[PDB]
């Protein structure tokens, strides 16, 4: 049997959690904004020559319900928007929650600076993300675009690789 991977996409409202997930799963860019309550997806992918079943939880941007998916989740994508400084600042608290709930520091994680196609609206320079990754003991870090498809697959594949290690 192929291994199953429970992945959780986290971050503040409007950063592109849903857009990244739908681009990855269905190859469609979601232009219309509708705030998520909870969406889940199942997709079979090949990672390092092996078939993998990915269970992806696309979470609400804005309790006990948060604790549960952190307890259950195996890998976490912490997403901010490069166009919104506050969404970047919000991520420290999310990380702290995860590590506390998991009761460990070694949790599969990736820092994702989304909307990298909107270069003219950039507020969060790539060096901020790199510095945060450094603070988090060399946490995986990528800049992505759900619209252009840049580094979309890489987000989820990297989490699988971290879970495998």
């Amino acid at each position: 049997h192929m291994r199953e991977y429970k992945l959780v996409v986290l971050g503040s409202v409007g950063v592109g959690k849903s857009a990244l997930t739908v681009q990855f799963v269905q190859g469609i860019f979601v232009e219309k904004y509708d705030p998520t309550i909870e969406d889940s997806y199942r997709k079979q992918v090949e990672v390092d020559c092996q078939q993998c079943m990915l269970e992806i939880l696309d979470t609400a941007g804005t309790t006990a319900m948060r604790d549960l998916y952190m307890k259950n989740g195996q890998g976490f994508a912490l997403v901010y928007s490069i166009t919104a400084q506050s969404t970047f600042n919000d991520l420290q608290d999310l990380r702290e929650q995860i590590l506390r709930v998991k009761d460990t520091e070694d949790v599969p994680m990736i820092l994702v600076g989304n909307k990298c196609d909107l270069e003219d609206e950039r507020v969060v320079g790539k060096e901020q993300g790199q510095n945060l990754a450094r603070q988090w003991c060399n946490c995986a870090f990528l800049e992505s675009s759900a619209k252009s498809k840049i580094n979309v697959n890489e987000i989820f594949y990297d989490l699988v690789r971290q879970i495998n290690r």
């Binding site: 739908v22 269905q26 469609i28 219309k32 509708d34 998520t36 309550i37 909870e38 969406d39 889940s40 997806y41 199942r42």
Partner: protein, 246 residues
């Protein structure tokens, strides 16, 4: 305004949680799901409710109020709403000649006659079905007749009428569901079973009626026929509304 979070399950076990207010019809939830799932929007897509305890299931009709249907569910319910393709749901509108016992022109004439006149015409369906005895793994073959208002039968000793046909059940009082695993559970002669139950009933009850059919075709005929009788012109309008989105 009453709001309800409804977790919708897809066939691949993916899910979408939607905020559904008290004014939403199944039609509205479907329109939302068409947008969110990026599906092909064909007329077979529907909301489908499953009752794991009773092991029954049915399509929502598109005009049904979603919050109202779910209001009957218990606090710790196992029931689920699914988003699935069910090609039987509008079978009469694609192939009316299969129920009213053909080219496009004559199909259209048949639907005009059956749905677009002063009153609907229900298929002239009758036949034997097996009726489960209350609380027993026992079945009795009986002859039933479909009418606009309900299912009828000829009282023991008397025959074809007129105002002497006794009513078995009135459709205003029940929803119609598929019965699952009735052969294993209740010794139904086949697994081609339909169930008539008041919407409120969520657990075993003498008032749930179990009907078993000799074959799949008979089941299809009765489920479609009963839905026509119960929902009438509304079902036709639902179909026209669905075609417009396809």
């Amino acid at each position: 305004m009453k709001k309800l979070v409804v977790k919708v399950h897809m066939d691949d076990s993916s899910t979408k949680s939607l905020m559904v207010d008290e004014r939403q019809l199944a039609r509205d939830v479907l329109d939302n799901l068409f947008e969110k799932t990026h599906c092909d929007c064909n007329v077979d897509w529907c909301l489908y409710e499953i009752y794991p305890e009773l092991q029954i299931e049915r399509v929502f009709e598109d005009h049904e109020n979603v919050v109202e249907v779910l209001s009957d569910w218990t606090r710790d319910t196992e029931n689920k709403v699914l988003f699935l393709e069910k090609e039987e749901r509008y079978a009469v509108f694609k192939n009316p000649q299969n129920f009213y016992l053909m080219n496009a022109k004559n199909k259209e004439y048949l639907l005009e006659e059956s749905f677009c006149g002063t009153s609907i015409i229900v298929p002239e369906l009758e036949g034997a079905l097996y009726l489960k005895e209350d609380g027993k793994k026992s079945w009795k073959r009986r002859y039933f007749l479909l009418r606009a208002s309900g299912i009828y039968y000829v009282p023991k000793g008397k025959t074809k009428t007129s105002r002497d046909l006794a009513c078995f059940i009135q459709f205003e009082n029940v929803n119609i569901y598929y019965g699952i695993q009735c052969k294993m559970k209740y010794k139904a002669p086949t697994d081609h079973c339909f169930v008539l139950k008041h919407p409120q009933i969520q657990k075993e009850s003498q008032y749930i009626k179990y009907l078993c059919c000799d074959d799949a075709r008979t089941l299809s005929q009765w489920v479609m026929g009963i839905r026509i009788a119960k929902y009438g012109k509304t079902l036709y309008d639902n179909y026209q509304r669905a075609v417009a989105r396809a």
